[PDB]
Structures are given as C-alpha cells and as structure tokens.
C-alpha cells in the first residue's frame, strides 16, 4: 500500500534468465548504506517455476564474503506481486519490464513501508541503459526514496559489485 504501480500483462515465464543489479534505491539509508547493508542484494537470475512461482537468485555481502542466497517468490492473485519468506509477510512488486532489456521491481514489507521498500533496476546485459534508468528514476518520485545507488559495468561483472 505505498507502491502504486504494478504491471498489467506480466508474462512471468518471459522474465526468465539472468539480469544484473544496475541500480537500486530505498526509503531509509541504513538499509543499503554499506556493501553489507541488509537490502544490498544483487539479482543474478530469474527462474520462473512450473507452479507459476518465481525462484530468485542473488548474491549478498555478509560474513566477509559474497554469498549466494536462493529466494523463492510465491504467486498471488495479482500476477505482478509475489510473497517472499523470511521476517515478515512480504511483497516482491514487479513494476515494469519489457522482458528483454530491463525490469523494475520493488520489495516491500506490508508491516513497514517507509522503512522496508527497496527497489531495483535490473538489466539483461552488463551495461548501462540510460532509458531503463530513466524509467527507473521517474517511477520513484511517487515514492519516498531516500538513498539511490548506481553501479558501472565493471562492478556489474564482479562479485557483489566489487
């Protein structure tokens, strides 16, 4: 109930494949600040599953290392919102993609918006897409984002973005 966009027409099985965490943004700063901040996470691939769910694969800096985590995201009635497991009843919100170049999704927590919402601009290939960043950047004024991070193709090709 803060993210007012969500895409009508989501063919999930078309989001499959790899992506790079190019850009990402959040509501308060403590959440992404340092490499080891909680929602500092790097999406590496989308396996849409047969049930219609989506397995998410992502690296994250924690105990000194770049650590994989598998996150599975369960269907809901809305095609574009999926519920994730961990520490509250969750949403992954998919905002916009063309399937083939970029993909915009946020990640909130129904218990605590202005403190949980984190958003990401994903891309299919390790290069900056201005127009994706365009579309990312223009979708988060309706949102109270307070930190923005951008990464460059080299950091995209490395573990945990350096």
Specify the residue, 49 or 109, whose C-beta has the smaller distance to ligand 0TX. 109
Whichever of 3 and 107 has its CB closer to ligand 0TX, that residue is 107
Residue 39 in contact with ligand 0TX, rule: CB under 6 A: yes
Mask of contacts with ligand 0TX, 106-125, x by CB under 6 A?
-xxx------x-x-------
Question: Closest approach of Cβ 84 to ligand 0TX, in Å?
Answer: 5
Among 1, 51, 86, 138, binds ligand 0TX (CB under 6 A): 86
Backbone φ and ψ for 122, nearest 5 degrees, come out as: -95, 150
With binding defined as CB under 6 A, does residue 59 bind ligand 0TX?
A: no
Residues that bind ligand 0TX (CB under 6 A): 38-39, 84, 86-88, 90, 107-109, 116, 118
């Amino acid at each position: 109930l803060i993210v007012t966009q969500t895409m009508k027409g989501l063919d999930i099985q078309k989001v499959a494949g790899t992506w790079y965490s190019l850009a990402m943004a959040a509501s308060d700063i403590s959440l992404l600040d340092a490499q080891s901040a909680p929602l500092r996470v790097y999406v590496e691939e989308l396996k849409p599953t047969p049930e219609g769910d989506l397995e998410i694969l992502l690296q994250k800096w924690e105990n000194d290392e770049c650590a994989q985590k598998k996150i599975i995201a369960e269907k809901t009635k809305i095609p574009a919102v999926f519920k994730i497991d961990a520490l509250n009843e969750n949403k992954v919100l998919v905002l916009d993609t063309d399937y083939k170049k970029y993909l915009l999704f946020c990640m909130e927590n129904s218990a605590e918006p202005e403190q949980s919402l984190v958003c990401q601009c994903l891309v299919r290939t390790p290069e900056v897409d201005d127009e994706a960043l365009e579309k990312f950047d223009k979708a988060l004024k309706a949102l109270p984002m307070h930190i923005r991070l951008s990464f460059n193709p080299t950091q995209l090709e490395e573990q945990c973005h350096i």
